[PDB]
C-alpha cells in the first residue's frame, strides 16, 4: 500500500472490501497481498478508451440497434492457453458473429470468455477423499493430488501473464486479417457442406453468400471489413486479482473514473450475487460495463433492486442481465423480470445464457448438456421478447473451436458413448465447433421471424 | 469545312462518307451542311475519358465480371424530354439495376436510351395518303400533316440542344442522390407490395432487403453507394448528326483517337447493317464502344465478319452483339453464332434485345408486344449461354417510368381493350413501369439458376 | 399560361411581376411570352437537391468554416461557349481553388460565372450613330449592324440550350477526373516555374507540394480528391428567362419551395438593385442562395434593409453581400456596412468583387483594369475584416483560361501597347490565366496573415 | 524435446545450434532447457502475417518509397515496463514519426525497441570487486549484490510475460486512438511553444500544421489517420529465448516458413556478429526481417559477405544494415560499404544508429552522449547518401518519453552537473523527450534538402 483513491470513492472502496466475498480461496494473506501489490503496477489487459468505446456499443445493444455475442471456454487453463486453441475460439466466435449479423440485420458486438476466465466457482468446498477440488488455474492445479490442489497466490501472477499473452494474440489475430469476413464465409460454407444436417441450413448459407457477393458488386472497399473488434470478459470473482487490476483514467472531456482493467466487461455470478456482498458493490463502483447472472429463483422485485444498484444513473447498456433459467423455466420466470425492470426505467441488455441452467449428470457419469435443450432456452428467450415487445440483446454460450465431444445432440448425433472419445474441459461441457456454428444459424433464424 | 484529320484516318474517313447510308432523310444539302458545321464546334454530349472508363467497364462485362443494363424510350421526343419523364426513366433504370446486381452477383453497368435517341428507322418510305411518315423528332414532326412531316435539317440542332439538356439532368440526378440504393430499394418494396403478383417475387425482395440491412450492419460508408453512373446511348443513324459530333482526344498516355461524342456508346441497326455501307465503316473508325443489332437471318459466318471489322484488335467489350431474334428463333439461331464468334477469338458482349424481334399488330389495330414472349426470349437467351458455357452479357429493353399501357401481359393483366386507355410512344411499344421492374426480378432469377 | 402557384406565393408572385424591371430588352411581347411558355417545361439547368446542398455549404462560409471562390467570363457568348474554352475556365477555377484551400485552411466552395451569364447590363441605352448596343447574346448579336443588334426573344431559347450544354460539360469534366488535385498541383508548378515572378510565390508552391506529398504518405484514398463540385451562377436580369426557369420542388422532409433553377446561385446587380423593383422581390421569393452587388454609394442602413428583405429568416449563408467599391473606397465605406449588418443578426457571406469597382478607360481607348488595384481592393477587404474580427467569405473575379491580354499589370508586365495583341471579351476586361493564378497565390497569402 | 523440423531446415538448425554464441549467460543447462520447452508452446509475441506485412513495408523502404523509424529504451526493465512509461515512449515514437513523414514526404514505418529488448551485451564479463555485472533483466537483477546478479533461467519466462504485456498495450494504445495524428500534432505544437529553441523549428511546425488543416479542408475521412502500426524489435541475443520463440507458419499461398516470433524484426549486434557464430546463422535461417549492427572496423568486402548470407535471395528490405560509426568516421567508412553492397545487387535498408558509436565517459563519471555529435552522425549519413545517390532508409535511436537527463546538449542545454538530477537507464544514455522530438525536426530538415 501507498496510493489512496479520491475522497468520493475511498469511503465506498473500504466499504466494499469489508463485505463478505463468497467462493474465495483459502491461502496466505501476507503473500497474496504481495502478489496484489505487484499486479498494481503492471500493464493492464485493456485501456479505458476501449472500455468507453464498448459502453457506447453496448448502449446500441440496449436501445435495439445491435446484438451481443458473448462466449468462449468455460474455464481457460494455462495448458490450453495456446496459439492454435485461441485461434480456433476466435475463428468460431467470428464465424458465428457474421451469421448472427445477417439474421439480426444489425451489428454483432463480439465479447469473449478469454484473457482472465480462470476462476471457477462451480464446486463443493471439499471433494471426495477429503481433498480440496480444482477452483481454476488462478487458484490451484488440475492435478488430483494435495500438492497441486494447494491454494497458491502466485497463480494470480501466472494468470495475469497468460491473460496478457491471450489478449495480445486476439488483438494480433484480428488486425492481421483472420477476421476478414470473405474468408470467414468461405469457412462457413465448408461447415454447411460437411455437416450431416447441411441442406437444413443451406438456404440461409447461400443467402449470406449472396449478400457478400452483392457487397462486392456494389463496389465497397474492405475498410471496416478486413478487421473486427473482439472484446474480452471473465467473471470478476477473486477479490485480490480484481482489486489489483483497478486503475484510474482521466476521460477526454475532463472527469476521472475508476475501471477494473482486468477485462473490458466483467460479470457477477449466481453464487456471488448478494446485494450486500463484495462483488455487487465492487461492480457498482467500477465504470466497466457489467453483467449479472440470473437464475430461476430470481424475483422481479430483486432484479429491479440489482438494476438500481448496478445502474444508478440509468445509462443504457451499462448493466446486462443474463438469464440462465433452464429450457422449461425461462418462459415462466423471465416475463415478470423484463416487465418490472423495463417499467423501472432501465434499458439493460437482455442476454440469454442457455448453458449454466441446463447442466445434468448423464448415465455415463460425465457432466453434460443436451444441444436441443440449449437451443430451446434461446427459442423461449426470443418468444418472451417477441410477445412482450422488448429487444433480445444477446447470447452467452460456452464453446471451443476444437473437435471435442462434450455436449449431447447436434447434427453429428453425439450420444453418451461418444463422450469419453475426446473430453478436454476444465469444468463445464462446451459446444463442439459444429454445434457452435449450428447454434448461430438457428439463433439467426430466430432473429428473423 | 476547314480542319483535316490526321493522315491515317482521313483516307478511311472519305472512304466512309462515300458509302451508301440507308434510312437517311431527304432534305436540302447546303442547309444540312451548315447545321453540321455549326455542330462541329459545340460542347460534346460526353467526354473521351468517360468513354475510356466505359470501355474498361464493358471489358469486365465481356470477361464475365459484370452485367450490362441498356434501355429507355424507343424514340425520345422533344415533347417528352422533360424533368418528370427523364426522372421516371432514370428511376426505373436504377431500380432494375439494383435487383439485377443482386441476382447476377456482379456490377450492373447502366446504359440508357437517352440524350440522342431521336432518329427512328422502322418505317415504310411513304405512308398512306401519299404523305411521308414520322422518322423521329431529329428529322420531322409527329403532326400528321405535310407541313410538319417536311424534313428539316434544323431539327439536328434542336436534337443536340435536347440531348445536352437530358444528359445534364441525368448527371445532376445521379450526383444529387436519387441514385442512393437505400431509397431505390424502398421504392422496390412499394412495387412488390402493390403488384398483383406481389407474393410471387417477395422471396427475392425480402432477400435483397436483408443484404442491404447486412451492408449497413457491417458498417460500410455510403461512399460508392450514394451515387451511380448512367451512361447514354442511341442508334448512330443520321450521317450528318453523327459526323458533326466527331471529336479528337489525346489519351493520357500520349496517343490520340477519334470519338463520336454524341453519346458514350453508339449502336448499328438491323436495317443499316451492310458491311460496305456507311454505318459499319463509321463504327469501325470511331473509338466508342459499339453495339450491332442481330436478327434471325444472321448466319454465324457473317457475325464473325462483323466482329473482325468492328473489333479489329480483339479488345474485349468493344463490340457488343445484340440478339433480337424473337422468342422462338433465339434458341435455334444463336448457338451457332456464339460458337463461331467465340472460336474466332472475340470476347464480345452477348446482349439480348427481346423487344424488336417480338413486335406484332394486335386485333385492336395498335402495334404491341406480349410480355410473356419478351421474357421468354431472355429465358432462351440464358439457356443458350448456360448450355454453351458462355457469359450472358446484358439485356436491351424499351421501357418508360410512366404508367402507360403499351405491352400486353405482365402482372396487371394488360388486355387489348386496355391499350387505348393510355398510349404515348413515338414508335415501338414500351414496358410499363411495373413490367420493367417485374422483368428485372425474373431476369435476376434467371441469373441465379 | 395554365398552372397557378400555391396561394401563399401567387399574391407575392403577381406583386413581383408588377414591379419595374430596369435594364430590360425592348422586343415583341406575344413572341417573348411564347418563348417563356416553351422554357416553362424544359429540363432545368440544376435540380433543387443541389441548391439545398449549396445552401448548407454556403452556411459554412457564413459561419467561418469555408471560403467562396466565384468567377469566370464577364459575359459568356455562344461563339465562346466551346469545349476548349469551358475546360480552360474550369481548370483555372480549380487551380485557384486548391491554392485558396491551402491558404484559407478550409473548404473552398467553387461557384462559376457559367451556364447562363449572357445578359449584360453595363451599357448606355443607345450607342453612337443612333444604333442600339450589345446587351448580351441572350438579347442580341455582337455584330455592329441594325440587323444583328435587333432584340430577339428566340435568343432566350438559344441561351438555355447553350447553358444546358455548358453545365453538362462542367459536370462531365468534374466527374471524369480533370478535377483530380494531384494533376492540378502539377499544372500549378508549371505556372510557378514559367512565371516571371516565379521565385516570388515558390515558397508557397513548394509548401502546397509538401502537403500533397504528406497526404499521400499518410495513406489517404483519393475518394473525395478525384472529383469536385463546381456550381454555376449568373446575374438574374431578364424577367422572362428567369421567370420561365421557376420550378417547385418538394423537400425530402415534406414542405415545398420555389426555386429559379436557371442556376444554383443567382445574384442582383448594382443597376437592378431597387428595393421595390422586380429583381429584389424576385430574389426574396425564390429559395436559391442569393448575392447582391454593393458599390460605394451604399449606406449601412439600406444594406441592413436589403438583408431584412432578402434574408427574412436569418438563414446563415442565404444572402451574400458583394463589395465592389474600388481600391480606395473599400477601406472607408465597408466597415460601417459590416458593423450594422452584423449587429442586425444576419450571418451573410462577405464577398469581394475587385473587378466592377476598378474599371477605367485607358490611354489606348480600350477599357481596362490594372491588376495591382484589383489585388489592393482585396488586400483592403481583408484588412477591414481582420480589424473588425469578422470572416472574409469569398472573392468574385472575372477571368479566362485563354492567354488573353485585357488587364494591365501582373507578373508578365502587360502595358497599354500589349492590349490590342489579343482581346476577346464581350464586355469587361478579364484576368489573364497567369493573373488568375497569381491572384490566387496573393489572396492565399492574405488568408494566412 | 519432441517435435522435429522439416528436412530442409533440420540440418541447418543443428548446424546453427552447434556454433559459438558470444555474450551468453552462465547458468544451469537442464533448468534453462526446461524454461525453453515451456516457452515453445506459449502464444507468440507476434504472428507471421504481421511479419509478412512488415517485409512488404520494409521492401518499400529499401526501394526508396518509405522511411524507417526504429527506437525506444536501450534496455527495458521489468520495473520500467509500466503503462505510463510505455505510453510515453509510444507517444514520442509517433510524435517523431509524423514530423519525419512530412519531411521525408513518404510513409514512416514505426519499429520500436520494445517487447523483448531485455538482453544487454555491453559489459566486461566480471565487474569490480569480483562480482558479475548486470546483463539485463532476462538474465539477472540490477541490484548490486551476488544474490540478485546470479544468472536465473526463470527470468526468460518473466521476460516473455513482460514482453506479451508490453505488446498487448502498444496494440491497445494504437487502436484506441492515442495514434490519432491531429492529437499528435497538438502535442508537437506544445513542444515547439515550450522549447528554448522554439522559434528555430517553428517554421516547419506551422508548415506541418498547414498540411493537416489542408487535409481536413480537402475532406479526407480519418480512416487510416485514426490508428497506426507500431512494430516491435529487440537484439536477438539469448540462444535459449530466441530458439524457444521459433514457430512455423503456412503462407496463404501454400509454402511454409520458419519465424522467430519473439518480435517482428530481430537484429544482430556488433559483438555477436561472427559469420560462423550462432547469431548470423540463426538470422539467415529465420524468415523475419533482419538488421545487423555495423561499426568502423567494417570493411566493404565483409559487408557484402554478410548481405550474401543474410539476404541469399536478394529480397529487397530483408537485410537492414545499421551504421554505428561515430560522427567522425561515418563520412570516411560508409561510402565504400554502400558502393560495394549496392554493386553486389542487394537493396538493403541503410539505417543510421548515431547512438552506440558516440558513447563516451564524461568528467562527472556517468556514461553520456552529446546531442550535437548524435545529430552530426546522421547529418553525415545523409551527406554520404546525397553524394552517392542512394536512399537513406532510416534512423535507429535510443530515447525515453520521461523527462530524464542522460544525454548532453540539445535545446535545454544539459551540462555535466545536470546528469545526476534524474538518471534512470539500465545501460546506455537515452534522448530526453525534448531531444527526441528536436532530433526528428532536424532529421526532417535533412530529408528535405
Ligand atoms: N468490423 C465490422 C464488420 C465485420 C468484420 N468482420 C466481422 C465478423 C463478424 C461480424 C461482423 C464483422 C464489425 O465488427 O461489425
Ligand atoms: N455506384 C455503384 C453502386 C450502386 C449505387 N446505386 C446503384 C444502383 C443500382 C446498382 C448499383 C448501384 C454501381 O454503380 O455499381
Ligand atoms: N472534393 C473536395 C477536394 C478537392 C478536389 N479537387 C479540389 C480542387 C480545389 C479545392 C478542393 C478540391 C472539395 O471540393 O473541396
Ligand atoms: N496510419 C498511417 C498514417 C498515420 C497515422 N498516425 C501516424 C503517426 C505518424 C506517421 C503516420 C501516421 C501510417 O502509419 O503511416
Ligand atoms: Mn461454465
Ligand atoms: Mn424500338
Ligand atoms: Mn463584368
Ligand atoms: Mn544501447
In this structure, the residue with its CA closest to atom 9 of ligand 3 is C98
Q: Is C111 in the pocket of ligand 3 (CB under 6 A)?
A: no
C-alpha C229 – ligand 3 centre gap (Å): 7
CB atoms closer than 10 angstroms to residue D336: 14
CA distance B220 to chain A (A): 7
> Which of helix, strand or coil describes residue D67?
strand
Q: Which atom of ligand 1 is nearest to the CA of B217?
A: 15
| Distance from C-alpha of A172 to C-alpha of D48, rounded to nearest angstrom | 10
Chain breaks in chain A (C to N over 2.5 A) after: none
> Which of helix, strand or coil describes residue B319?
strand
Residues B212, B181 contacting (CB under 8 angstroms): yes
For residue B416, list its beta bridge partners: none
| Distance from C-alpha of A89 to C-alpha of A115, rounded to nearest angstrom | 12
Restricting to A residues 229-258, those with a Cβ less than 8 Å away from any Cβ of B are: none
Residues B371, B407 contacting (CB under 8 angstroms): yes
A398 is in an annotated binding site: yes
| Distance from C-alpha of B61 to C-alpha of B265, rounded to nearest angstrom | 14
Q: Which of C234, C248, C257, C284 is nearest to C15 (CA)?
A: C284
Residues B310, B271 contacting (CB under 8 angstroms): no
Residue ranges in A362-404 assigned as alpha helix (H):
371-388
Question: What are the grid coordinates assigned to B136, written together?
Answer: 423521329
| Chain C residues lying within 8 Å of B177, measured CB to CB | 49
Between CA A120 and CA A126, with CA A121 as vertex, the angle to 5 degrees is: 105
Q: Which of C283, C285, C306 is nearest to C294 (CA)?
A: C306
What are the residues whose beta carbons fall under 8 Å from the beta carbon of D213, sequence distance 6 or more?
C105, C106
Hunting for cell 466466435 — which residue is that? A93
| Distance from C-alpha of B346 to C-alpha of B275, rounded to nearest angstrom | 18
B428 is in an annotated binding site: yes
* Per-position DSSP letters for A49-71, written without gaps between them: HHHHHHHHHHHHHHTTS-EEEEE
Question: What are the grid coordinates assigned to B115, written together?
Answer: 440524350
Nearest CB among C207, C217, C225 relative to D105 is that of: C217
Residues A126, A133 contacting (CB under 8 angstroms): yes
In C285-374 the beta strands, taken as DSSP E runs, fall at 290-294, 319-323, 349-352, 360-361, 367-368
Hunting for cell 485461441 — which residue is that? A86
Between CA C16 and CA C21, with CA C20 as vertex, the angle to 5 degrees is: 90
Give the CA distances from residue A441 to residues A197, A394, A433, A445, in Å, rounded to whole numbers and listed in that order. 12, 14, 13, 6
Between CA D357 and CA D362, with CA D358 as vertex, the angle to 5 degrees is: 140
Dmax over CA atoms of chain D, in Å, equals: 67
Residues A54, A231 contacting (CB under 8 angstroms): yes
Residues C433, C94 contacting (CB under 8 angstroms): no
CA A155 to chain centre: 22
Residues B434, B427 contacting (CB under 8 angstroms): no
Question: What are the grid coordinates assigned to C56, written together?
Answer: 448548407
| Residue D4: DSSP 8-state | P
Which of C60, C70, C98 to probe ligand 3 with, by most ligand atoms within 8 A of CB?
A: C98
Inform me whether the C-beta atom of residue B144 falls under 8 Å from chain C C-beta atoms.
Answer: no
| Distance from C-alpha of B313 to C-alpha of D445, rounded to nearest angstrom | 52
| Residue A133: DSSP 8-state | P
Nearest CB among B211, B217, B221 relative to A107 is that of: B217
Residue ranges in D63-145 assigned as alpha helix (H):
83-104
What are the residues whose beta carbons fall under 8 Å from the beta carbon of B56, sequence distance 6 or more?
none
Residues A426, A142 contacting (CB under 8 angstroms): yes
Q: Which atom of ligand 2 is nearest to the CA of B229?
A: 14
Cβ-defined contact of A50 to D176 (cutoff 8 Å): yes
| Distance from C-alpha of D73 to C-alpha of D91, rounded to nearest angstrom | 13
* Per-position DSSP letters for B331-344, written without gaps between them: HHHHHHHHHHHHHT
Restricting to D residues 210-229, those with a Cβ less than 8 Å away from any Cβ of A are: 223
Tell the burial category of C137 from Cβ atoms under 10 Å away from its Cβ (0-12, 13-18, 19+). buried
Q: Which atom of ligand 1 is nearest to the CA of A181?
A: 6
Technique used by the depositors: X-ray
Between CA C415 and CA C423, with CA C417 as vertex, the angle to 5 degrees is: 90
Q: Look at phi and psi of residue A232 and say left if phi exceeds 0, alpha if psi is from -120 to 50, else beta.
A: beta
| Chain B residues lying within 8 Å of C44, measured CB to CB | 83, 169
Tell the burial category of B372 from Cβ atoms under 10 Å away from its Cβ (0-12, 13-18, 19+). middle
Give the CA distances from residue B57 to residues B121, B180, B195, in Å, rounded to whole numbers and listed in that order. 29, 21, 34
Beta-carbon pairs below 8 A across chains A and D: 80
What are the residues whose beta carbons fall under 8 Å from the beta carbon of A169, sequence distance 6 or more?
A83, A86, A87, D43, D44, D47
| Distance from C-alpha of B329 to C-alpha of D400, rounded to nearest angstrom | 81
CA C260 to chain centre: 16
B247 — phi, psi (to 5°)?
A: -140, 150
CA distance between the termini of chain B: 56
A46, HSE (Cβ side, Cα atoms, 13 Å): 26
Long-range contacts of residues A78-85, Cβ cutoff 8 Å, at least 24 apart:
A78/A137, A78/A158, A78/A159, A78/A162, A79/A142, A80/A424, A80/A426, A81/A162, A81/A165, A81/A166, A81/D42, A81/D43, A82/D41, A82/D42, A82/D43, A83/A169, A83/D43, A83/D44, A83/D247, A85/A400, A85/A401, A85/A402
Question: What are the grid coordinates assigned to D170, written together?
Answer: 502498444
Inter-axis angle of helices D433-448 and D181-194, to 10 degrees? 100
| Residue B235: DSSP 8-state | E
H or E segment and range at residue C249? strand C246-250
Hunting for cell 480484481 — which residue is that? A242
| Distance from C-alpha of A298 to C-alpha of A289, rounded to nearest angstrom | 21
Q: Which of C108, C26, C383, C73 is nearest to C233 (CA)?
A: C73
Q: Which chains touch C (3 or more CB pairs under 8 A)?
A: B, D
* Count of residues making up chain A: 449
Inform me whether the C-beta atom of residue C339 falls under 8 Å from chain B C-beta atoms.
Answer: no
| Chain D residues lying within 8 Å of A86, measured CB to CB | 43
Q: Is B219 in the pocket of ligand 1 (CB under 6 A)?
A: yes
For residue A100, list its beta bridge partners: none
Residues C405, C418 contacting (CB under 8 angstroms): yes
Cβ-defined contact of B105 to A223 (cutoff 8 Å): no
C-alpha D123 – ligand 8 centre gap (Å): 11
| Distance from C-alpha of D179 to C-alpha of D184, rounded to nearest angstrom | 7
| Distance from C-alpha of C173 to C-alpha of C324, rounded to nearest angstrom | 31
| Distance from C-alpha of A205 to C-alpha of A208, rounded to nearest angstrom | 5
Tell the burial category of D118 from Cβ atoms under 10 Å away from its Cβ (0-12, 13-18, 19+). buried
Q: What is the resolution of this structure in A?
A: 2.5
Chain breaks in chain B (C to N over 2.5 A) after: none
* Per-position DSSP letters for D344-402, written without gaps between them: TT---EEEE--STTS-EE-TTSSEE-BHHHHHHHHHHHHHHHHHHT--EEEEEEEB-SS
In A285-414 the beta strands, taken as DSSP E runs, fall at 290-294, 319-323, 349-352, 360-361, 367-368, 392-398
Q: Which atom of ligand 4 is nearest to the CA of D181?
A: 6
CA distance C204 to chain B (A): 28
| Distance from C-alpha of D214 to C-alpha of D212, rounded to nearest angstrom | 5
CA distance between the termini of chain D: 56
H or E segment and range at residue A304? helix A300-310
Question: What are the grid coordinates assigned to A301, written together?
Answer: 422485485
Inform me whether the C-beta atom of residue A168 falls under 8 Å from chain D C-beta atoms.
Answer: yes
Residues C385, C350 contacting (CB under 8 angstroms): yes
Q: Which of B301, B293, B254 is nearest to B272 (CA)?
A: B293
| Distance from C-alpha of A220 to C-alpha of B269, rounded to nearest angstrom | 37
Q: Look at phi and psi of residue B166 and say left if phi exceeds 0, alpha if psi is from -120 to 50, else beta.
A: alpha
Cβ-defined contact of A105 to B213 (cutoff 8 Å): yes
Give the CA distances from residue B242 to residues B29, B160, B247, C161, in Å, rounded to whole numbers and listed in that order. 16, 11, 10, 19
Hunting for cell 480606395 — which residue is that? C328
B151 is in an annotated binding site: no
| Chain B residues lying within 8 Å of A107, measured CB to CB | 217-219
| Distance from C-alpha of C396 to C-alpha of C401, rounded to nearest angstrom | 16
| Distance from C-alpha of C377 to C-alpha of C328, rounded to nearest angstrom | 7
The torsion defined by the Cα of A101, A107, A113 and A115, in degrees rounded to 10, comes to 130
CB atoms closer than 10 angstroms to residue A302: 15
What are the residues whose beta carbons fall under 8 Å from the beta carbon of A248, sequence distance 6 or more?
A5, A256, A257, A258, A259
Q: What is the β-pairing status of strands C392-398 and A108-113? A: unpaired
- Please report which ligand is nearest the Cα atom of A108: 1
- Please report which ligand is nearest the Cα atom of C430: 7
D182, HSE (Cβ side, Cα atoms, 13 Å): 12
Question: What are the grid coordinates assigned to D135, written together?
Answer: 546483463
Q: Is C100 in the pocket of ligand 3 (CB under 6 A)?
A: no
| Distance from C-alpha of C276 to C-alpha of C284, rounded to nearest angstrom | 11
| Residue C145: DSSP 8-state | S
> Which of helix, strand or coil describes residue C20?
coil
* Count of residues making up chain D: 449
- Please report which ligand is nearest the Cα atom of D425: 8
Question: What are the grid coordinates assigned to B68, written together?
Answer: 450490362
Q: Which atom of ligand 1 is nearest to the CA of B218?
A: 3
CA distance between the termini of chain A: 56
H or E segment and range at residue B278? helix B278-285
C-alpha torsion sign, points D178, D182, D183, D184 = positive
Q: Searching chain C, which residue's CA lies closest to the CA of residue B83?
A: C43
Q: Which chains touch B (3 or more CB pairs under 8 A)?
A: A, C
Buried/exposed code over C141-157 (b: 16+ C-beta within 10 A; e: otherwise)? beeeeeeebeebbebbb
What are the residues whose beta carbons fall under 8 Å from the beta carbon of C95, sequence distance 6 or more?
C184, C187, C188, C191, C436, C437, C440
Inter-axis angle of helices C202-217 and C83-104, to 10 degrees? 90
Give the CA distances from residue C306 to residues B349, C18, C274, in Å, rounded to whole numbers and listed in that order. 61, 20, 10
Residues A295, A267 contacting (CB under 8 angstroms): no
Inform me whether the C-beta atom of residue C445 falls under 8 Å from chain B C-beta atoms.
Answer: no
Q: Is C99 in the pocket of ligand 3 (CB under 6 A)?
A: no
C-alpha torsion sign, points C150, C35, C49, D222 = negative
Cβ-defined contact of B168 to C173 (cutoff 8 Å): no
> Which of helix, strand or coil describes residue A420?
helix
Question: What are the grid coordinates assigned to B445, written together?
Answer: 432469377
In B274-381 the beta strands, taken as DSSP E runs, fall at 290-294, 319-323, 349-352, 360-361, 367-368
Ligand 2 binding site (Cβ under 6 Å of any ligand atom): A 218-219; B 94, 97-98, 101, 107-108, 179, 181, 184, 224-225, 228-229
| Chain B residues lying within 8 Å of A64, measured CB to CB | none
> Which of helix, strand or coil describes residue C201?
coil
Buried/exposed code over A208-232 (b: 16+ C-beta within 10 A; e: otherwise)? bbbbbbbbebbebeeeebebbbbbb
Question: What are the grid coordinates assigned to C395, written together?
Answer: 472573392
Interface mutation target, options B101, B211, B212, B448, chain A, most CBs of A under 10 Å:
B211
Q: Which atom of ligand 2 is nearest to the CA of B101?
A: 10
Nearest CB among C161, C168, C178 relative to B171 is that of: C168
Q: Is A444 in the pocket of ligand 1 (CB under 6 A)?
A: no
In this structure, the residue with its CA closest to atom 15 of ligand 3 is D218
Inform me whether the C-beta atom of residue C53 falls under 8 Å from chain B C-beta atoms.
Answer: yes
Give the CA distances from residue D53 to residues A360, B108, C248, D319, in Å, rounded to whole numbers and listed in that order. 48, 34, 56, 15
Beta-carbon pairs below 8 A across chains B and C: 80
Rg (CA), chain A: 21
Amino acid at each position: 500500500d501507498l496510493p489512496p483513491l479520491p475522497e468520493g470513492m475511498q469511503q465506498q472502496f473500504e466499504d466494499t472490501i469489508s463485505r463478505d466475498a463468497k467462493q474465495q480461496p483459502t491461502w496466505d494473506r501476507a503473500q497474496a497481498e504481495n502478489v496484489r501489490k505487484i499486479l498494481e503496477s503492471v500493464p493492464p489487459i485493456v485501456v479505458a478508451p476501449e472500455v468507453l468505446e464498448l459502453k457506447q456499443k453496448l448502449a446500441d445493444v440496449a436501445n435495439g440497434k445491435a446484438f451481443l455475442l458473448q462466449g468462449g471456454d468455460c474455464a481457460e487453463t494455462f495448458e490450453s492457453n495456446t496459439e492454435p486453441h485461441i485461434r480456433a475460439n476466435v475463428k468460431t466466435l467470428l464465424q458465428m458473429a457474421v451469421v448472427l449479423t445477417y439474421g439480426a440485420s444489425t451489428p454483432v458486438i463480439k465479447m469473449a470468455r478469454i484473457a482472465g476466465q480462470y476462476a471457477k466457482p462451480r464446486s463443493s468446498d471439499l471433494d471426495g477423499n477429503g481433498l480440496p477440488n480444482y477452483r481454476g488455474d488462478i487458484v490451484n492445479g488440475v492435478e488430483a493430488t494435495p500438492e497441486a490442489r494447494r491454494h497458491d497466490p502466485a497463480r494470480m501472477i501466472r494468470a495475469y501473464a497468460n491473460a496478457s499473452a491471450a489478449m495480445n494474440l486476439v488483438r494480433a489475430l484480428t488486425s492481421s486479417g483472420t477476421a476478414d469476413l470473405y474468408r470467414l464465409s468461405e469457412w462457413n460454407r465448408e461447415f454447411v457442406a460437411n455437416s450431416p444436417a447441411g441442406a437444413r441450413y443451406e438456404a440461409l448459407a447461400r443467402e449470406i453468400d449472396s449478400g457478400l457477393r452483392f457487397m462486392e458488386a456494389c463496389g465497397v472497399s474492405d475498410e471496416s471489413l478486413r478487421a473486427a473488434d473482439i472484446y474480452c470478459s471473465h467473471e470478476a470473482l477473486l477479490v485480490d486479482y480484481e482489486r489489483s487490476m483497478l486503475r484510474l483514467a482521466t476521460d477526454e472531456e475532463g472527469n476521472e473514473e475508476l475501471y477494473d482493467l482486468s477485462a473490458h466487461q466483467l460479470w457477477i455470478g449466481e453464487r456471488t450475487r448478494g446485494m450486500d456482498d463484495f462483488h455487487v458493490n465492487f461492480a457498482s463502483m467500477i465504470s466497466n460495463p457489467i453483467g449479472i447472472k440470473i437464475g430461476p429463483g430470481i424475483t422481479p422485485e430483486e432484479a429491479v433492486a440489482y438494476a438500481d444498484k448496478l445502474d444508478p444513473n440509468f445509462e443504457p447498456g451499462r448493466l446486462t442481465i443474463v438469464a440462465r433459467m433452464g429450457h422449461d423455466k425461462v418462459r415462466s420466470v423471465l416475463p415478470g423480470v423484463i416487465q418490472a425492470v423495463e417499467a423501472s426505467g432501465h434499458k439493460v441488455i437482455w442476454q440469454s445464457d442457455p448453458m449454466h441452467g441446463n447442466t445434468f449428470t448423464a448415465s455415463n457419469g460425465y457432466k453434460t448438456r443436451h444441444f436441443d435443450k440449449v437451443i430451446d432456452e434461446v427459442q423461449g428467450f426470443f418468444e418472451v421478447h417477441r410477445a412482450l415487445g422488448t429487444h433480445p440483446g444477446g447470447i452467452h454460450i460456452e464453446f471451443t473451436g476444437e473437435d471435442v465431444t462434450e455436449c449431447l445432440g447436434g447434427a453429428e448425433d453425439i450420444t453418451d458413448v461418444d463422450l469419453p472419445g475426446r473430453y478436454e474441459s476444465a469444468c463445464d461441457p462446451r459446444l463442439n465447433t459444429q454445434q457452435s456454428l449450428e447454434l448461430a444459424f438457428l439463433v439467426a433464424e430466430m432473429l428473423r421471424n
